[PDB]
Write a protein that binds this DNA or RNA. Sequence first.
RNA 1: CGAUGGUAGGAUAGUGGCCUACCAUGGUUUCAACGGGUAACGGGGAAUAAGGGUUCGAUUCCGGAGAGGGAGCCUGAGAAACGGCUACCACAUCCAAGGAAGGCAGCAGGCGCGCAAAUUACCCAAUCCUAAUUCAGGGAGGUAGUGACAAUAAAUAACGAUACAGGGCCCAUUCGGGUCUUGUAAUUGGAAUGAGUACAAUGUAAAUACCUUAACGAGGAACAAUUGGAGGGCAAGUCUGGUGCCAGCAGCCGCGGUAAUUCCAGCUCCAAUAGCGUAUAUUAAAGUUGUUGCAGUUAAAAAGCUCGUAGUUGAACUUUGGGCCCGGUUGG
Lengths: 144, 185, 48, 39, 260
Amino acid sequence: GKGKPRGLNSARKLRVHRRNNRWAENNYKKRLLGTAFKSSPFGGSSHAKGIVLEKLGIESKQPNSAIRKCVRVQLIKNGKKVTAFVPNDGCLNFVDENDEVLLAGFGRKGKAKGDIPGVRFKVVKVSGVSLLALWKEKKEKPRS
Amino acid sequence: PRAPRTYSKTYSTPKRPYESSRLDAELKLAGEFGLKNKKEIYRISFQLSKIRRAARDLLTRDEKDPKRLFEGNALIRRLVRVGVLSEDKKKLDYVLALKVEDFLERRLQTQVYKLGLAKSVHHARVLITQRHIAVGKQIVNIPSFMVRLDSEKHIDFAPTSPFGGARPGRVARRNAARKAEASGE
Amino acid sequence: MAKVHGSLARAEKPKKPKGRAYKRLLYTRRFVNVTLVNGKRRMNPGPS
Amino acid sequence: SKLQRKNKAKQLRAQRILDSIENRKLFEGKNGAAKIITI
Amino acid sequence: ARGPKKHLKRLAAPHHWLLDKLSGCYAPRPSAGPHKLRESLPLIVFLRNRLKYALNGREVKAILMQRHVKVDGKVRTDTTYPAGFMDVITLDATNENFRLVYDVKGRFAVHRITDEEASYKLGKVKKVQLGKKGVPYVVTHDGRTIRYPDPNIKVNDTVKIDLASGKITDFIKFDAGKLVYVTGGRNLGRIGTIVHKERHDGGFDLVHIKDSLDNTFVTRLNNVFVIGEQGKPYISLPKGKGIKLSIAEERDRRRAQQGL
RNA sequence: CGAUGGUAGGAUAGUGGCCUACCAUGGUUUCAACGGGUAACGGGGAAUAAGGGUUCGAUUCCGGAGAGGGAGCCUGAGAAACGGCUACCACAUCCAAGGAAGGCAGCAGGCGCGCAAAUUACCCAAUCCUAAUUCAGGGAGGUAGUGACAAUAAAUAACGAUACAGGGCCCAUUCGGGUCUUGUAAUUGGAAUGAGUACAAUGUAAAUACCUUAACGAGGAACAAUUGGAGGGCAAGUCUGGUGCCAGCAGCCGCGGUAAUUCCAGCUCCAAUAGCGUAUAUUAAAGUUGUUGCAGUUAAAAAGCUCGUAGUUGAACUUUGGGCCCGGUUGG
């Protein structure tokens, strides 16, 4: 008999069980409780600006092994701090500090059995100039 | 404030991007007819796939049902008036097997090459763009005119173009101003 | 590095043709001629 | 409640918005100003 | 708000005036007068959107200030005076006389009449009461009060009014088998005759009306305007004469008439 | 300290616990009252869509509320009004120190914040409203500047000659006798044209621009298309160069330990052509929310056991058949 009621005047059990155990869909519970403000470092935004504390070097332990270059930062609207990532100056020659930077996220989920370890962010521009415009060398960093 | 101005989008891309048996039949239409990109071929499949949907449900409701008779005999009447349905195929089931080049063979780029004015299908789209061809009295310059049926027979050159009319362009005038005055010196 | 500001227009390889003419070129190079490697098919190949 | 803005706002900027006052407003216009203009 | 409103926005204007939805931002708002707001038509929608005489608002005021346009034998200069049903609009420097009456698809029609039909006006009967110092009066649908009527007049009847002195010539009762115009709703503008009228106590009463081609319909009591006895109206009807034509019937009747 | 009702007054434009007197002891609730959250103004509507549905609606129309935060009233047909007044609270401006003035969630513009949003321009010509009135007024509204927010139309090349190739149909004798198709020959020729500029005219309240048009305007090698990829998913390379210059390495399986069929570069190809390139939300894919429509033993998942609330669900039966006759549109 399927283990659910079928008769005609039964619409109240049917609609009150459905929102009862709709709380196991994993990203409907995130939306009604609203955990995007209370826990996320961004608060619900695409990008965010911070100011860089210092250069860091991080490594990936099991099967892979090389020299992943990341950066500390401190967000202006929040005060909390995160560790971003800068893409492929694999030459080890773009340290920069006490600068204004713009982060973003990865399209995130991954595999860290090679231990490409636990950061969640990246960098799209720095001090008012895009990153690729420096790597492809279309601008150079503004200063006097 | 004021009233808002309606608009609509006119094409739609397909669901699977890189699969090969699609990609070639689109290519062989773009070389056959000379079309700029594949947005021009999506433009003709959209317009078709709303015609097909419009007849797809008048077939469901009964015959001798006065919405089938008023909206049917107008949809049929408009497709013949531009010349896509054959004149013996005036029945509503026959539009459900219409194809996409039965509209592609009615553009001005295609109906001027068949009617003997340009030596190739790429001599059409450059003849039209440069204001040479004029159905009726009106210089058109759009390679997608979709000529109505009882005005296939009016296309000719323009009463302003150097081909079918008056003064030559500013090469021949410039060449005559490069040689005829230079005959003495 | 940057753009040059003086581009006023009042008063190694040869080019490719751009636009509808490029669709004409591709129609020839795979649908008016042929390329095989013994019936088996590796068109646009590596030179060997 | 959500006065925590007025905590975090009115106790982030109170001295950083104070380092740049009197250099801008020593020129109030009855006696204390002289703007020097060359042409 | 706090007081009355005084602007009418363009999309909120009544549909059967056919103002185009791009020329401006507001519409004419009709003044307070004889006929209701969404049941009338100002003198600027007549003189520049129907007869095409004037091309502006500044041209309409130049026409009205020369004291040409009358309504019901009286001069008006209010540029949004509310002319409504059965009103007579007598220009003078063309010797034309008009009468406001309904189309069939639901519109206010241009109608030219004679120089003798423009001396009178019908009007229905909205209430009949006993006034101060014991005299009775009668209230029409456009709001004229008229003291001392015949006693046999009741409500929902129809009077005939002489526009010269403002008086009554004769009247028509309200019963089965009469000629009736329909002035509001969905079957708006159709003319037919009364089959019978059932009554609901404390509710809205329904009449059943037969056409001339013998097809029937039902409306409420208050959208029903008596015109005359059968086959004989008292006014000059428009073309079509209130016959509903199906959309099938009026494509081909336009096709075969297309011989120009 | 009115909560639910009865009787009589007060007050109001007027009904009514709206308020005041005396009395009665009521009213709401598992068919979810009362309380808590809302990064909640409500609807017409919007995106996606086999069908059922999921997610949005601060925002051009209609309805409500507000004018730094609460309270109070004047004039009036109409306001508890803020481009009206008066008090306290938070602010802040000028000062001859006696005092006196103030509210941009109207329009342009500010130094603030943040990922995040235009000119202190011209006019009442149109649309409409107000006034003692055809004439005056209107940052309401119209016209331009700034605008890759979105949507429609579509330039960046088209024709010849020989030439040398092949295929090619055929004259084939075998040649070439025709028809072709390309291929290429910094091999050669002449025609077409608007991007741009600019007399006039037209537009317009005046102008600017679009439609029309004198003279000018190309071999185009320069009047020069760009973003992203080339193990797999998923269209496209067996190509040469690093001592690993300039190595984790590309959503996820993974490729590096020299020379790599992926990093870094050159060449040649592929895809879209104005890129949907990256980020964050949501919809389809999803029968992974299941009314349509899932899952019972071993894979997540049947409560220790029987009596029993509310809720849901509950056997069959009581006028069928027969006869005559008119009048519909359909196959005919």
